[PDB]
């Protein structure tokens, strides 16, 4: 049983520095790259960066380069992210995830997330277009979710479900590959620029946000999401 356990909720003053942690169990910590993801309103997901725990190599989203530093403590099997000069714009839920599993790897295990509050006191990036933005359906309807890439990315698309108060869950990797434990109603297709996630028959437990993600080019990017909701 693999687990990524994140440190507790934080509340800091503007201008402060903050280090948050991600500790692993059930597998060899140096096996897979660690990723940090920022959750903002929508919900919306942004990729901050990645660290390779075996050698400490990093790759950052340029938007976060002056803000966050990724590090690992191999002796403690713990990954860290340190923020500097925190502002109201940094208040968010931050997730850690590993990029592993059976080959080819994907963001398969995620931490529970860390809420960070910064208290007020007393261009060449791949664009992923998700449509329809909202799907209002009755359980039993068959649905299809689209993800259009700004340029050809072969089969480097992955699909995530995100339910309220929960961490993202990997549904499909590399456009069409099935994930262990994921129900058979979820399937994916496409290559190049047009990708589809199909849900054979929507269940009540499926309502939430669905995000596509590309991992062909730096920075890794997400679509804006499709909200799957119960028809009024």
């Amino acid at each position: 049983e693999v687990q990524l356990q994140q440190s507790g909720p934080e509340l800091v003053k503007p201008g402060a520095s903050l280090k948050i942690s991600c500790k692993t169990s059930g597998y060899t910590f140096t096996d897979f790259t660690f990723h940090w993801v920022k959750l903002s309103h929508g919900p919306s997901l942004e990729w901050i960066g990645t660290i390779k725990p075996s050698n400490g190599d990093t790759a950052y989203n340029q938007k976060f380069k002056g803000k966050a530093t990724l590090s690992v403590d191999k002796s403690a099997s713990t990954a860290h992210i340190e923020f500097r000069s925190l502002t109201s714009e940094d208040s968010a839920v931050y997730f850690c995830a590993r990029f592993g599993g059976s080959y080819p790897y994907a963001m398969d295990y995620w931490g529970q997330g860390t809420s960070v509050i910064v208290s007020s006191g007393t261009a060449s990036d791949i664009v992923l277009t998700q449509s329809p933005a909202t799907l209002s359906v009755t359980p039993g309807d068959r649905v299809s979710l689209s993800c259009r890439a700004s340029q050809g990315i072969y089969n480097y698309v992955h699909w995530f479900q995100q339910k309220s108060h929960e961490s993202p869950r990997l549904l499909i990797k590399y456009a069409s590959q099935s994930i262990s434990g994921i129900p058979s109603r979820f399937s994916g297709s496409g290559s190049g620029t047009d990708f589809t996630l199909s849900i054979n028959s929507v269940e009540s437990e499926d309502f939430g946000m669905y995000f596509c993600q590309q991992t062909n080019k730096w920075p890794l990017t997400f679509g804006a999401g499709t909200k799957l909701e119960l028809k009024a």
């Binding site: 790259t33 790759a59 990029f99 790897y105 991992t215 062909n216 080019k217 730096w218 890794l220």
Partner: peptide
């Protein structure tokens, strides 16, 4: 495939 060295190897 610029991310493979980092993510897959």
């Amino acid at each position: 495939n610029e991310t493979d060295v980092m993510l897959l190897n």
